[PDB]
Amino acid sequence: SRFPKFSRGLSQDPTTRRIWFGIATAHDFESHDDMTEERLYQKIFASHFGQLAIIFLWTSGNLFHVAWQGNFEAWGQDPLHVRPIAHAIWDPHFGQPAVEAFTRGGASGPVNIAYSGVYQWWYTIGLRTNQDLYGGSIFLLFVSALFLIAGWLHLQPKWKPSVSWFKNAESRLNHHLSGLFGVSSLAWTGHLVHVAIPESRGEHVRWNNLLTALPHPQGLGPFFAGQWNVYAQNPDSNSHLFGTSEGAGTAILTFLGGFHPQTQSLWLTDMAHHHLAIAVIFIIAGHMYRTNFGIGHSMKEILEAHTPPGGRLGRGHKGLYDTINNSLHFQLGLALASLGVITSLVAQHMYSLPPYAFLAQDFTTQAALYTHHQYIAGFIMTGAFAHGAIFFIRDYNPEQNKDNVLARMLEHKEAIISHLSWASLFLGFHTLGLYVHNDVMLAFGTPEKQILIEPVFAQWIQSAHGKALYGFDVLLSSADSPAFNAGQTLWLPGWLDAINNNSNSLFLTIGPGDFLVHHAIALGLHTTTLILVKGALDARGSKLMPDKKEFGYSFPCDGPGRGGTCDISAWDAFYLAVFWMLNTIGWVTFYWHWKHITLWQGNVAQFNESSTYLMGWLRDYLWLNSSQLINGYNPFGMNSLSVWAWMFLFGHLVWATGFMFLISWRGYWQELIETLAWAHERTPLANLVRWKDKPVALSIVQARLVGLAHFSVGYIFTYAAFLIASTSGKFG
Amino acid sequence: MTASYLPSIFVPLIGLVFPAITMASLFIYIEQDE
């Protein structure tokens, strides 16, 4: 029983593949040998605890480095002219120009400038000194230690929970909606009201004076007497400076809307009310399902009773409760689908409605924070679709799902794949033809001959929000609508002042280039959805190979016969759609960074004239913003962007190195390693050294994964460098 | 910076010693015949 011990079939492999696949089949717990239901769910539960401990031990070190090597107090004194320091650098390979050039933010040595928005976050939430961040780091060290204790505890046989506890979906949803989403957002509200609002108003509220510092002039009297408007009585004025007592109000739960006029960020009183609202509604929504007390819902009978009587949905959702509850890949795919749609809702709502103080002014931090959640969301959504494919191979029972909606997806799967194919082809011919046409017209000396389409649907939606720039004047931009008159005394005085401003990123002025790149975005989502729906629905089998389910999920191919069956598996469709999410989110974040990099220095006409054709994208965005990127180090000297100039070139290595695994395939390298094995076995003084693992080439799935991971690492490092060097070196 | 010398200690151990601890202990572990 060698490594890997979870799979007996890989332990008898005498090659290097045994070393490789044991790393990659390490967390695929259900594919293990001598493996049961209880061990599956308990190992997944303790792996969740280890994941929670890693997240909290990560946050602890991102708090410890700000408290220890970062100037959080100096950034708190002046958040506009001080660069936030992540951590100090101890590199033995620096020369004296590198030590003298990485010393930023008034530090004593070479430090890294934090582009993660942790200073803006911790400032808005109430943390002011380094001692508060250190106490938070020790507290989250304790929390991660408690989660390690709980992870070890639930693997002990006294505290092992059974699968019936794990598959209790009603109790899990009630205690998740009530506890995880309700009492934590009500806990939050208690922080935002007790700590963050008085620290925005200058009052230092800590644990020593928690029971004495009253958050309102009349606290908990008007709450229980019903007059809640006392908590919205005296809001913060427009002369309020953040962190100071002057210009401040006393109301803890306002409904002002819009932005704080000095930080260009959301009001802590609004976010406190926001959390009291997504706390009351989640504790009320957490009393829905039936657990132990007679009242509630059984979701099995909800899904059984939700059948349309015309038969257009077949049996409806009958048999889907056992389908989700028995399949961990269905629950994980649903969780990652929801998580991608909310990690992208995170990205879309922290740039346009900045929630943290002095985050809108720090431009490259905002750029990093958008690109972060759009790449983490384009890998979470692809993981959702890949887990739908793994559900259809190793977890979907056609007998249990008989003529329900999930079986009817397989019944008309060629219609879904062909219509996603039509939509992708439509968007591709139209977007490419219009961009290439606008390229030809700028090439042929005639900018007026472009097909420029004003995006009047989304401009109509912006005028429906309150933008008076386009002059549609339908609702919330005209005073004759009932929605405006229902809102003009309640939230719209903040919202209209925030949306009619042209310096912020709240619902920006869009044009024909925005139309064209939104069809690029629709092309990217549609073609990624095409490959992923095609992988998920041809997961069990297809007309080329009907027994794809009996070959597992991530099998390489089926041989050169029947024309050729390369990339036939559903993992290979996931593999081909990782390139499409990289291209999609590359287009998304190209559009974001160029729409904002022209907004921040003022000349939005550069984007309005140049984004309609791809030579403007190549020249005015990829070439123009890379001026101080690749000049980070020269023969003459090196700048502070030099690490971002190396990380850019580094990306062009790793990405191109992926091509070595994605173009060249196995048997060339297998014969090459055969010649290498002969050469080592015949070389004098080196033949004495043996291998225990037989040297083989990388296997076919492993080759696609290694090329895909290299492609992804190079792709995220070329853009992390360019994006954090073409905004942080030319601020604006 | 509070203690400037812990950069000079932990970056050599977690950068040189700890991979030399981890990769040598794994190479023993992955090539155990058991």
């Binding site: 280890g50 408290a67 380094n130 250190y134 230690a145 390690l148 070890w152 002990q156 | -």
Partner: peptide, 30 residues
């Protein structure tokens, strides 16, 4: 700014956390 002795408190509490991470990894093995 934080002090010298507070770094000692953090390093012990991370070493205690590193033991509890080592204890879970032994139990995840078994």
């Amino acid at each position: 700014s934080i002090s010298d002795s507070q770094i000692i408190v953090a390093l012990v509490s991370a070493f205690i956390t590193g033991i509890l991470a080592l204890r879970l990894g032994k139990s995840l093995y078994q």
